[PDB]
Amino acid sequence: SIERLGYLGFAVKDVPAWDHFLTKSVGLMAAGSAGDAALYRADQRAWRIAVQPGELDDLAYAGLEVDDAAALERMADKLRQAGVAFTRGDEALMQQRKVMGLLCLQDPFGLPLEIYYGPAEIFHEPFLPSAPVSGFVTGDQGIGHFVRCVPDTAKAMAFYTEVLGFVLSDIIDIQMGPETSVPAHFLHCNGRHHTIALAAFPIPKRIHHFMLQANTIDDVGYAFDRLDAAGRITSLLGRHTNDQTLSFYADTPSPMIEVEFGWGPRTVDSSWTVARHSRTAMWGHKSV
Amino acid sequence: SIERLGYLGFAVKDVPAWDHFLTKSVGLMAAGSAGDAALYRADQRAWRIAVQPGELDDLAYAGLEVDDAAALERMADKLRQAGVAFTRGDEALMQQRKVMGLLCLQDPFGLPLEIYYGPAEIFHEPFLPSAPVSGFVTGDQGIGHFVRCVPDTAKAMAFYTEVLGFVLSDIIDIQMGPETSVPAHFLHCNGRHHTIALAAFPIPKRIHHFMLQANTIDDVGYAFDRLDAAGRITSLLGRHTNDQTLSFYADTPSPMIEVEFGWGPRTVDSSWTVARHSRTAMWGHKSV
Amino acid sequence: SIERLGYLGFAVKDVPAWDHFLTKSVGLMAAGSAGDAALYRADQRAWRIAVQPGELDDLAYAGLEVDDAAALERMADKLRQAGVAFTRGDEALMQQRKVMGLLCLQDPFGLPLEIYYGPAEIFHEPFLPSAPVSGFVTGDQGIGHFVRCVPDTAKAMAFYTEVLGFVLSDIIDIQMGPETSVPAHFLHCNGRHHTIALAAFPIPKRIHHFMLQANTIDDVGYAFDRLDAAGRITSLLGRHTNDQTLSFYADTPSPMIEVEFGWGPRTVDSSWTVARHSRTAMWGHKSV
Amino acid sequence: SIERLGYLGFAVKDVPAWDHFLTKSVGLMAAGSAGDAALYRADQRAWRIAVQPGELDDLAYAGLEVDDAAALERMADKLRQAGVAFTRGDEALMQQRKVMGLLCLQDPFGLPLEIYYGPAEIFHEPFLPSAPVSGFVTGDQGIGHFVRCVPDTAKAMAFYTEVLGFVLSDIIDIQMGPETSVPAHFLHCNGRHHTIALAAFPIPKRIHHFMLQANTIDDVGYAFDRLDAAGRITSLLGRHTNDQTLSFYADTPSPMIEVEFGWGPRTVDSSWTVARHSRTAMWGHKSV
Amino acid sequence: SIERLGYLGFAVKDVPAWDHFLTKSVGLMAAGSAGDAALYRADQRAWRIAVQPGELDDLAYAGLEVDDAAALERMADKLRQAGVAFTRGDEALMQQRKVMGLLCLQDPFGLPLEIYYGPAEIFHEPFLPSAPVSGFVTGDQGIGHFVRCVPDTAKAMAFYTEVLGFVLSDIIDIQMGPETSVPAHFLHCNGRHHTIALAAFPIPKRIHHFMLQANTIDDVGYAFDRLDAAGRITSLLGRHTNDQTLSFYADTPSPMIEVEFGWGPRTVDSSWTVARHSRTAMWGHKSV
Amino acid sequence: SIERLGYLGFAVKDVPAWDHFLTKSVGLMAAGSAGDAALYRADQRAWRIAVQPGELDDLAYAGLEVDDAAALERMADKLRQAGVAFTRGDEALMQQRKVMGLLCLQDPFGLPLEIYYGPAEIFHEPFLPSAPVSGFVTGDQGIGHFVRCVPDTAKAMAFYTEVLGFVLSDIIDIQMGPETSVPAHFLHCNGRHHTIALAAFPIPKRIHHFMLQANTIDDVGYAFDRLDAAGRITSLLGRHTNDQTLSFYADTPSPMIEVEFGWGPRTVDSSWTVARHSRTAMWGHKSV
Amino acid sequence: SIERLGYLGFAVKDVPAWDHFLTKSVGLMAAGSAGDAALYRADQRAWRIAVQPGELDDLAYAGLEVDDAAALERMADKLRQAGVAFTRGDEALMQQRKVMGLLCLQDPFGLPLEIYYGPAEIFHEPFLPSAPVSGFVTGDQGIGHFVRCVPDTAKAMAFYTEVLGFVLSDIIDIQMGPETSVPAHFLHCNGRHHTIALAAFPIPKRIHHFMLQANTIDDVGYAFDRLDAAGRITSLLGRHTNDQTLSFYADTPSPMIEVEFGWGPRTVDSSWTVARHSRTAMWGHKSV
Ligand SMILES: [Fe+2]
Ligand SMILES: [Fe+2]
Ligand SMILES: [Fe+2]
Ligand SMILES: [Fe+2]
Ligand SMILES: [Fe+2]
Ligand SMILES: [Fe+2]
Ligand SMILES: [Fe+2]
């Protein structure tokens, strides 16, 4: 099974705006480039987020990490047994993502996934944020999470759980209209309450948002003000019912894709009981 | 196996008296109604105790929780293999109990049991006690425990352990008369010392008592005084020999059913040694 | 010297609105009445806030606590030596405020102050909030703080420090207009960063706001939503530069008087260095 | 496998001397009698040591505890499979030892062993020592340990490990004469460094000593003085190389059987490496 | 008495080199300018180090902080009583250093000292290091320390202790030649082992070095490499005998003035015993 | 699988120089001799390092420890199944190494390995360092680690992982020349980040270095100075990227074999993710 | 007042025996010589115990430490005011004891005392014990304590308390014969329960014993065995009633002077109540 979400690549129409957004607003460290992708760091990893030019204005690929070469071959076996097409990343691709091995595939609705092992770390170039943020919570929980939009949540669930080994944490019925709600399914693969959530939202993007977790509540408060100065806030500060992430949301430069910047969630384990919630917000998060 | 006791439903002759008892005396939060049942909360769950009108004046059903849908199907398999009749709760019932799935059955002596998963939580309506109680100890240990009266403890034991997966903690020989004792068997299914105890008591009720665990010793002391003002005390403060719950007992409005309000018990695990005790009270608990 | 702020009395045009505000929105416990004043509790004290009818729509009196009878006589001596007029509260007044002794005086700009000792506690009637709030931080730090509006900050400073024994913590230059700021002076008399702040604001009220400190960040988040539902929010969540209180502001039913509901400030002692800040908000607190 | 050593029974020529020894010198609580045996307590158990009259002046039986009835049947199966004779204790015997079930057998060299479950606890009669001792370390580690004398350590080892499930901790070569040592084998069955040690000593007793573990170093120091006043000391205070028990030894009233009264040993687990030591004493323990 | 060292101003021949040194090498945050001085931050203070153009290539002034206005007047009284000339900083100077009041004087050998209160803090512009450094240890211990070169240590000692209220921590005999040592006197005014040390070194500078204290050992290790890349290292890593600061030394761009970048010293209090050391280095610090 | 590295034997041209090096410089305790080998201790074990005369000037054997006799037989089975030749150490050899049993074999490139159980401990002769070192970190992590030079890392990897049960922690690409790097593979067998690393270095020795871990940072600093006085330093203090050992390197008296003396590394477990690093030093370690 | 006992000098008939005793038996570090005195260390101080040749076979002087030069002058003033003769140590003496200043005097019964400040520390030569001892408890509590024999305890008490500033901790009536006891008075001058005790013993020595405090109980146990091997033990292990030092006693090479080697005493402060004890030993300490 997948151990954690390790990296995200975006293909965007406004590379300079994304560069400013990730550095001066979010606080990530610029980390050079690989090919036509600008790289950004949140920790000891050589890169966590890549930004390349493209008309998609969307998530172009997600890197799903396993712990060693044998684990990667076991995932190849799981894909074969499930009839899921995949290819082995070539040397050029391994070099581009700075990994020792990877399998390239897509989820049932077209999102490219890369299952990899052996990522590059650069402790001799210690992390230096570009904006005042004390650090991010990553480690064994990976980079954060994202909410994946899908046309068929049951079909997506079968793939992410049965093939990739994610596990359902809980469900939130998200009220859309007067008598319309969407059941968002939240999936974990480590202690992070969720790494991927699945929802049948009427949005023309592959994801609704990605989330980064900062070390302190002040990190979140300060970030809110930077994103507000940029005119990007989409939600007031609030706290979620299920993971209890205390966060705000803001627009990325790609329309309809948001970032969530948060602190202090609950973590999970093998004893996490599936439960259902009727609201996303325990408090706050008023939409603006 | 069952993971925890999640809810209790009572069918009672005096609904208003039960309402006052659970709120002003015990401290639970009123939480509206579902059908003809008044609902009461002790924590983040949408409800923990339901009270409906009925001549039984007794426990009408107990909800036994598992952690996910697959666990529920495994319980269905266990019931089938054991020859225990059950039905699948219909949509109306799922809606009524606010669960994602449930199996309806009875124990060997007629107590309706509901095995369920996916209960509703409402963190956007944070718990507010109706009387001064700092909170209850629930979580993975469920709502509390009850003592189930049975005509044949061996037969009840075989069902609760072999079919439902409860585990014997210990036994207390409860002296009834000069040369008559009843061997009460205490069963766990999580860290709570017991969730169900079985005893062959000469009482015409399905249970002898249910127990709620408060966070502090003062919570218990204050509650004693509220129940004393109501004229309901049945035992002085005391502490049990086996779980070391420090509690008092009081009459509910249903004759012969008591509540136990306690604090500070021992918890158990896979290393809990079966032992036998000759008394229920390490100290106190004088009957009044 | 004064040890802490113990109580506040308001004279208001809409007593029912204040009652609902203090209970259902703020979470205080209704605690009966004394004379024509409705009483409200935040802790073990018989009362902390009193609300009486009056056209002022303002703070009518503040209770400044000392620790014993001899301390009260020493304050009487300080008042005499400073030429500050005062009277000794009569039996009726002592009974009304539930204190063993008190001195009645005014600050230089007309705010009635009551210096008292021997307040009433009622631990047999344990605190029960009227809205979901886990508790307030009071104890030796008293009930909270207020910002006192004055026409002459130097004159007010001389009285509060030299006569009453408050000590300057720090100053914030609060920008009012393009080239106009008001230097707010923050005074402590115990570990609370400030109990009274002095500012020459162009407001027709005796105070700008009073502040209550809740135990948790969720207490603050939940309260924000209750005050938002009431249409009373005046500031978004934020954190102050000097005391680092994380709070929001809301309108009380008395025009131009606000409440601040907060969490997590720094505390002070004899080693607190006077410093100057150019902004009230380290982050957040956008006015709405 | 055996979980812990729970009780010891001695058959002795001088019952009154043993009574005084166990109470006034060691500090155990007198706990009545069962049949012709005087009972002694160290904790919540109804009894830990029994003393009956007999010419043996030796250990008459040792009680080896398991956690439940099914575990007892599994031990019966292990005995059957190994060809070890045993009988099931009858009702009279169960009553005498205050247990729910037991198997009676002998080790290869004639020591009666009783494998049992469901011992009696009496928390309503809290432990009261007969001499100043703050308490004993028992719980999951059982009552203590004993050193079993055997003519053939390999044969004894095969029985205790393969049949009963004890595990080797380590070995000490105990120098007896100029060019003669005995390899003492120390066996655990829980966190206690050893519960039974095996040694081919030239002593005409079944055991060399039994050990009780007190809570504090002062407990040991005070006990030394009581046993010294009784003229029973056989070793000065010292500390063992392998378990690091800090103890002294003294003669029981039965010639050639000693007691060890100690404090502060190391505990073990599944990661304990077998090692060999050339001396019993890290420091002290000079023979007197 | 002086409470702590709060700021340092340098007058230097190569302002750009100092700018790069303080930011990219040391890690301080650039914080704009005041007049012809470039400002640098280490924490919440608006500035800690100022760099202005000048031929001195030396420390131009040191800011000595007190906690309030009355403390400043008491220092004025001490200066008057001691016959030490001083002037009161005018409005322009107060504005330039961002303080509420200050006294300008010199030590007996010409170093300008500024005794001040009410420094500016800017928590709304949170500290952001320019190089990877997790933070500095400042707070009540002030910015760090410096070693003041003097022609007459006894005369300097009398001034710093009797007039300014510094206290001797200890002395190190620093061997200069074969039979020549200089007794360096280390003075504290808060928990920092020393804030000013006095030594009669044959150097043509006012100070030998200034020291900044980083939060972690890795901060120091990483900084060593940055200063080594710049070709500035003057000492290998080492640890001092008296304060046990673990540090290295490097050249600033002003010849003969060094910086010390360190971690982990001992702190002092009223119980610190004066002692004498024969070496500066407990280990390391080899000169290069 | 192998549990830990327990001992090292060197065959050297200058036994007296090695004796002085291990005692006065490193701090090990001289512990007599066995045959023609001088023995040295770091802890409770009778010996950890042996030095015998020989022209090799290299590591002559490494002792790989398992926890009991059955574990040793399981290793014999693994060797048989893998076709790896081995012999059983005879009584003389067991006596020489002070072990209860051992298997003698070689790795694929000629390094003699001894797999053993039942080492001798001598707690009655407590460890006494020969130079100021507070102690070493050994225990379940064994004596330390070494870097094994091999001509074929893949072949060495297959043996150490598949046959002996070591597990890959991570890889560092060690740059040798302008366009030449060697991929060093770091292997663990317990919590120690690595016990053996494999690298295809162009060195004519079996190992590049062995490492000992001291308890404190001062232990390392003091040791640096002792080895510097001896003229043996080969690296300045630094910290590694992968295990984060803070250490320095020095020459042993055998040319081309170094010692690493370090502190404070990270430890590993079953959740350690394989990663790749481009440098050995997070900071420091400049070669001298 | 005196702050602590810092050093002891002995004049002895057998310097080599004292050298072996202090190093190989007690564990102190040999630290060269000063004049005709051999020096010994227990910590960072250049020396703690000096041994010179002399027929006295007794304590020749005790060093009483104060914290600074002004404290030394205040002691000179106290001596003058009390009429106690003293001289100022000359340069040669200061050099000999490695102190910055000292006053030479005697107690009323001829023991030379040296009151000093500014002792030498040598952290660049870290402490290395000569026998297995983990370290000594010194610091602010000084080197240990001694029991001073006096002909008139009241007269000695007046001097040590009124002149030197020691404070009575408690008294023990030490039974000498059938109807003869000596009231030993125990005096502190810091947290150490006592630094000097006064007793009218019929011994022809200035002191009965001096005591060193080791860090661990094993340090004491191991030391007991070393002193036993040397044939010097005078008391078995035991614990004192008043300070609760757990120690043993042994003969020094000077007849009638003993050493006490201990662990774990209680410490004192301004709230220590004077009490009386009838025995020296809470347990143990049997004389041999
Ligand atoms: Fe999210
Ligand atoms: Fe109960
Ligand atoms: Fe406020
Ligand atoms: Fe033993
Ligand atoms: Fe320095
Ligand atoms: Fe290494
Ligand atoms: Fe003593």
DSSP result, B10-76 = EEES-HHHHHHIIIIIT-PEEEEEETTEEEEESSSBS-SEEEEE-TT-EEEEEEEE-SSHHHHHHHH
3-class DSSP assignment, residue G17: helix
Report yes or no: C51 and C200 within 8 Å, Cβ to Cβ. Answer: no
**Residues ≥6 apart with Cβ < 8 Å to E268:** E169, E188, E191, E192, E193
* Measured distance CA(A132)–CA(F77) in Å, rounded: 58
Cα(B233) to centroid(ligand 2), Å? 15
Cα(A209) to centroid(ligand 1), Å? 7
Count of pairs with CB atoms under 8 A, one residue in C, one in E: 46
* Measured distance CA(D147)–CA(D245) in Å, rounded: 14
Nearest to C120 by CA among C50, C48, C192: C48
Nearest to A279 by CA among A196, A194, A183: A183
**Number of continuous H segments (helices) and E segments (strands) in chain F:** 5, 19
* Measured distance CA(C112)–CA(C11) in Å, rounded: 12
* Measured distance CA(B257)–CA(C177) in Å, rounded: 70
Longest Cα–Cα distance of chain G, Å, equals 55
DSSP state of C190: S
Alpha carbon separation from B118 to A280, B78, B97 (Å, rounded): 16, 20, 10
Q: Give me B254's structure tokens.
A: 């249903």
- The chain B residue lying nearest A285, using CA atoms, is B124
DSSP state of C139: G
Superfamily of domain A133-286: 2,3-Dihydroxybiphenyl 1,2-Dioxygenase, domain 1 (3.10.180.10)
Q: For CA atoms C101, C104, C107, C113, give the dihedral sign.
A: positive
Alpha carbon separation from G102 to B157, E288, G93, G116, G165 (Å, rounded): 85, 40, 9, 4, 17
Q: Give me A122's structure tokens.
A: 């650069």
Cα(C79) to centroid(ligand 3), Å? 28
Do the domains E133-286 and E1-132 match in fold?
yes
Q: Which of E24, E25, E26, E128 to mutate to test the interface with A (most CBs of A within 10 A)?
A: E128
Is A278 close to B123, i.e. CB distance below 8 A? Answer: no
| Alpha-helix runs per DSSP H in F30-180 | 69-82, 91-97, 153-158
Report yes or no: G102 and G116 within 8 Å, Cβ to Cβ. Answer: yes
Of the candidates B168, B272, B275, which has its C-beta nearest D121's C-beta?
A: B275
Q: Do chains D and G touch (3 or more CB pairs under 8 A)?
A: yes
**Residues ≥6 apart with Cβ < 8 Å to G207:** G58, G59, G146, G147, G148, G149, G257
Supply the DSSP string of D254-288, one letter for each residue: STT-EEEEEE---B--TT----EES-SEEEE--B-
Q: Which residue, chain included where needed, has tokens 């493209």?
A: A54
Nearest to C5 by CA among C148, C127, C130: C148
* Measured distance CA(A199)–CA(A185) in Å, rounded: 6
Alpha carbon separation from C286 to A261, C208, C231, C282, D114 (Å, rounded): 18, 17, 16, 11, 76
Residue E188 pairs in a beta bridge with E167
N residues, chain A = 288
Nearest to F44 by CA among F132, F141, F125: F125
Contacts of E246 in chain G (CB under 8 A): none
Indicate the CATH number for domain B1-132: 3.10.180.10
Report yes or no: E98 and E92 within 8 Å, Cβ to Cβ. Answer: no
Report yes or no: D114 and D64 within 8 Å, Cβ to Cβ. Answer: yes
- Phi and psi torsions of D82, nearest 5°: -85, -5
- Phi and psi torsions of C18, nearest 5°: -65, -35
- What residue type is D40 in one-letter code? Y
Q: Which residue, chain included where needed, has tokens 């010390």?
A: E260
Helix (H) or strand (E) holding C85: none
Strands B276-277 and B167-177: parallel
- Phi and psi torsions of G255, nearest 5°: -55, 135
* Measured distance CA(C189)–CA(F121) in Å, rounded: 63
For A15-51, letters b (16+ CB in 10 Å) and e give beebbebbbebbbbbebeebeebbbbbbbbbbbbbbb
Please state the domain extents for chain E: 1-132, 133-286
Q: Which residue, chain included where needed, has tokens 């077209």?
A: A110
Q: For CA atoms A221, A223, A227, A232, give the dihedral sign.
A: negative
Of the candidates E241, E272, E283, which has its C-beta nearest G121's C-beta?
A: E241
3-class DSSP assignment, residue F197: strand
Q: Do chains E and G touch (3 or more CB pairs under 8 A)?
A: yes
- Phi and psi torsions of E101, nearest 5°: -175, 150
Residue E261 pairs in a beta bridge with E212, E248
Nearest to B185 by CA among B205, B201, B164: B201
Cα(D276) to centroid(ligand 3), Å? 69
Helix (H) or strand (E) holding E222: helix E217-229
Order across the sheet with F246-251: list the strands: A120-121, F276-277, F167-177, F180-188, F196-199, F145-149, F207-213, F258-263, F246-251, F238-240, F281-284
Contacts of E241 in chain F (CB under 8 A): none
Report yes or no: C240 and C281 within 8 Å, Cβ to Cβ. Answer: yes
Give the side-chain half-sphere CA count within 13 A for A264. 17
Chain B interface with D: residues with Cβ < 8 Å: 168, 171, 241, 244, 271-279, 281-283
Report yes or no: D275 and D170 within 8 Å, Cβ to Cβ. Answer: yes
D99 to chain B nearest CA, in Å?
8
Report yes or no: F82 and F162 within 8 Å, Cβ to Cβ. Answer: yes
3-class DSSP assignment, residue A113: strand
Kindly identify the ligand whose nearest atom is closest to the C-alpha of G210: 7
Nearest to F260 by CA among F235, F226, F286: F235
Report yes or no: G3 and G44 within 8 Å, Cβ to Cβ. Answer: no
Strands F120-121 and G37-41: unpaired
* Measured distance CA(C273)–CA(E96) in Å, rounded: 20
Conformational region of residue B256, where left means phi above 0, alpha means psi within -120 to 50, and beta covers everything else: left
Report yes or no: B44 and B123 within 8 Å, Cβ to Cβ. Answer: yes
Contacts of C132 in chain B (CB under 8 A): 126-128
Cα(B273) to centroid(ligand 2), Å? 19
Is E67 close to C272, i.e. CB distance below 8 A? Answer: yes
Other Cβ atoms within 10 Å of C268 Cβ, number? 19
For E188-225, letters b (16+ CB in 10 Å) and e give bbbbbbbbbbbbbbeeebbbbbbbbbbeebbbbbbbbb
Helix (H) or strand (E) holding E107: none
- What residue type is A122 in one-letter code? I
Contacts of F222 in chain E (CB under 8 A): 282-283
Longest Cα–Cα distance of chain B, Å, equals 55
DSSP state of E136: B
Kindly identify the ligand whose nearest atom is closest to the C-alpha of G146: 7
**Residues ≥6 apart with Cβ < 8 Å to F273:** A3, A65, A67, A68, A140
* Measured distance CA(F178)–CA(F172) in Å, rounded: 16
- What residue type is G227 in one-letter code? L
Q: Which of F4, F95, F124, F192 to mutate to test the interface with D (most CBs of D within 10 A)?
A: F124
Opening angle at CA C244, ends C239 and C247, nearest 5: 40
Is C241 close to E124, i.e. CB distance below 8 A? Answer: yes
Q: Which chains touch D (3 or more CB pairs under 8 A)?
A: B, F, G
Contacts of E122 in chain C (CB under 8 A): 277-279
Quote the strand ranges of chain G, DSSP E: 4-12, 29-34, 37-41, 49-53, 58-65, 87-88, 101-106, 112-117, 120-121, 145-149, 167-177, 180-188, 196-199, 207-213, 238-240, 246-251, 258-263, 276-277, 281-284
